[model samples]
Target chain A: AMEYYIVDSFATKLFKGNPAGVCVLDRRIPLELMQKIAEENNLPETAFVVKGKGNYELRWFTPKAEIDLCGHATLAAAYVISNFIDVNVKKIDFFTQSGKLEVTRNGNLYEMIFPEIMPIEIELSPQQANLIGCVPSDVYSSRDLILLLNSEQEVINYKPNYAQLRKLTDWLGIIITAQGSNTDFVSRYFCPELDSEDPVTGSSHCNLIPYWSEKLGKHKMVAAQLSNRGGIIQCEVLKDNTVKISGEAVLFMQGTIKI
Target chain B: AMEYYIVDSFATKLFKGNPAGVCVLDRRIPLELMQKIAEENNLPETAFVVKGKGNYELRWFTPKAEIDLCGHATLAAAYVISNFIDVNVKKIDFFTQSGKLEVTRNGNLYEMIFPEIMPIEIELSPQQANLIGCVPSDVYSSRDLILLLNSEQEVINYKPNYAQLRKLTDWLGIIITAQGSNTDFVSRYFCPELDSEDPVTGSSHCNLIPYWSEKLGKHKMVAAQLSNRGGIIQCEVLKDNTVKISGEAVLFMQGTIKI
Candidate 1:
């Protein structure tokens, strides 16, 4: 019997975040088989954990393929350990494809010390501009689309032609943004070509906060994502291109799987 | 008063399609003010057009903002020539938000022909994984997170913790998909935190079509987007990381905006 943990990680107020299905296996499983299982589970991602020499070797899978890193599922797995596996451990370290990541609990919030990848400026090519549908006052590129608008209102009211955007580029969707009205900045993202529009993207801020921090000359800032199920992040600019992103998570359910 | 010919460029076969705003202005308007007008219009996109020498200058704006390049609005503006505006000329050249763009009608289907950018794979970091909850076998980063699954059933059974996902990334949501069961492929995208989960995403396929086309070894494919207000796309993978994505858009409403 495989013990399955249905932990809701990265949730702020109960059932409001992305969820993952996790399974702690007692035996080894094949990668193809795991992929098959993820397909069966039909979740965005699923994790399979097996005991290693000193730490647990964890593997992740989506219904379609295997991924190297996963944020919410790791939190859910940590949540499972604190509440179900080992309630006494204060912190947990995960050995993943990205690297060794650490997770700790502070009251109801889970703080994960993660590796940071800072964004760099790139000249906005004509091709990039065509993809977003609007030419920015200033255009910058990191890993994703970082477009600067005149005001927060501009960011708030944005639309793009998916068909035209589809013709442009395929990195990440475009990020149309401007200085925030209440917060430090506000932004909207669209990837109609990617099967989503205005996704709740917290990672994109890894590049955004740094860029804005230097431009605005601020360290501590509040960032609000203007997606439908809106979210807020308390962002701190750290040294070496690393930024500390803090948020709250809520647990939705727990269950077991028979494999 | 300046006369501008506006068109909804990316509409479907008939009037069924998405709409965009097209404007032909005499001069370059203040960026801030244009954004304000876009917010007021509150449409997906609005295009601005100005005749310059031998060519026509064009720009686009959305309800919540202004954009550099827009497909539908360009088409809409071009369509106006046949319907609203009388331009016997076959093709119109546009100097637009996306540098330069062109729109032409192929019988019924209006094509906003532009450059195409393909997707490249990136390695996932541990910090990135914790946000989504589940780890994928192989993470394919396009404009969004495209996690590959094994079968079609899994794509249909996806259950995401939207709240957790909200904490993970800010722009561009996650696209979990699988090889097409009956069609070319099937996918589901979630940006619950973004207030709206789009029914069908055409732009996402900019990366998706190339990724799947290469992986599946097929150039031409059909895709079905699984959303509440679902949609479909006919995709063709082209050379140089470009994918020609065409779809039909239904005009939901067309009435004068009294301001």
Candidate 2:
């Protein structure tokens, strides 16, 4: 039997965060079986963690296919491992497709170490400005386009033009962000290929934390994703171009797979 | 703590049918809590089943709101009760918003008793033809619009225009169907407001079985829903405006939800 858990990452509340599936296996299983289980979970992503010598081997899969890297699922897997699988462990070493990663548990919060992405400042196209439904203060480019809005409310009220957004395929996805009134920053994510907006995103924050930290003149800050289902993230800019993304997770469901 | 299981209805194989979440509660929980759990599950429907005097009480909820009746969830609840909750029971009686529903176990199949909808024949409009991308041999009206195409391939190939389909407010949803090559009939369902097609719809089959029975002169027939994730249903026409929709379900995930 394999242990499985559904966890809400970046959330302190029950249903207000991005959900991911985590499976802790005693040994490795066939990729086809793993894919089938991931598809059965039907969440955005499911992480499979297998016990290796002293470290753990991890893989992530979306409902449709195996993804190279998934931030939220990795967080979820770390949460499950720290809380349930390796109860007393303070930190975990994960060998993943993205290379070796580390997650440490602090009280109720689990902090994941990820590479920081520095977004290059760029001019916004009229079509891009029109797609977000408002003119932004600034625009930047990285793996995704980042638009700096004036206020958090503007990010909240912004309606997406998916038909037009899909046409602006220069970047993998788009992010609309602003300085938060309560937290240090607020943002939302829109992937052109996705049918709906992402509730909570972790990878986008790698770029968000560094940019917001420099702009706000603070190394440590709080961030929020302002989607309908909201999430709170704690971030810090560390040395060596790395960011510490920390958040709390609640266990929603725990079970065993017969396979 | 409440026991929960994610079951794939109308399918004997894993991840091939409509997935529904079933929670077997010792007692009734708040409607708000039920909705939260359903939303957390993120499936099309989640069923809350509580023990009643002799019969079990059942309720269905989508992620957003509570629904009056759900066929797939009801079948999923029955599969959970008969197999897991009450292992020795041969049948389960459920009191729902739609009144009393009885489901019985036969070998590996669970048969659900449902009201057979008799559709009224209607003419296909030009706009409706354009919406479906093909002119059907016949059109019928009930709670939803039913289009009878020439062959199963036509039903499989039909693309949906959700923007234009939602304009069809006269019907609840749309079902494109035809004579199946392997089975008696095949179908695909599209809700006007839904972002995607329903993989295996059970209630639509209630209307489908009786309608095809008269046209094909067979009271009992096998049906297949040809969505990307396919499902097979065993249907039988019974006396007094009732139909027996029988199908096999596989347990996908079994776990517990901490309240």
Native contact share for candidate 1: 0.00
Summing lDDT over every window of 10 consecutive residues in candidate 2 chain B, give the lowest-scoring window.
Answer: B124-133
Model 1 alpha-carbon drift over 4 Å, by segment: A6-9, A51-53, A114-118, A151-153, A159-162, A189-193, A197-199, B1-259
The docking category that best describes candidate 2 is medium
Q: Please, what is the whole-model Cα lDDT of each candidate in the order they appear? A: 0.62, 0.88
State TM-scores per candidate.
0.46, 0.93
Off by over 4 Å in 2: none
Query: DockQ, per-model, please?
Result: 0.01, 0.71
Pairing residues by index, what is the TM-score of model 1?
0.46
Q: TM-scores for chain B, in order? A: 0.70, 0.95
Q: Where is model 1 chain A poorest over a 10-residue stretch in terms of lDDT?
A: A250-259
Encode model 1's per-residue lDDT on B19-113: one tens digit a residue.
45444455667777566445433345666666556777766776566566555466666665444344445566677656776655555454443
lDDT of 1 by residue, A21-137 (tens): 677766787787677556544455688877556676677887678888776577667776666666757687777787787777776556554335556566756766665677678
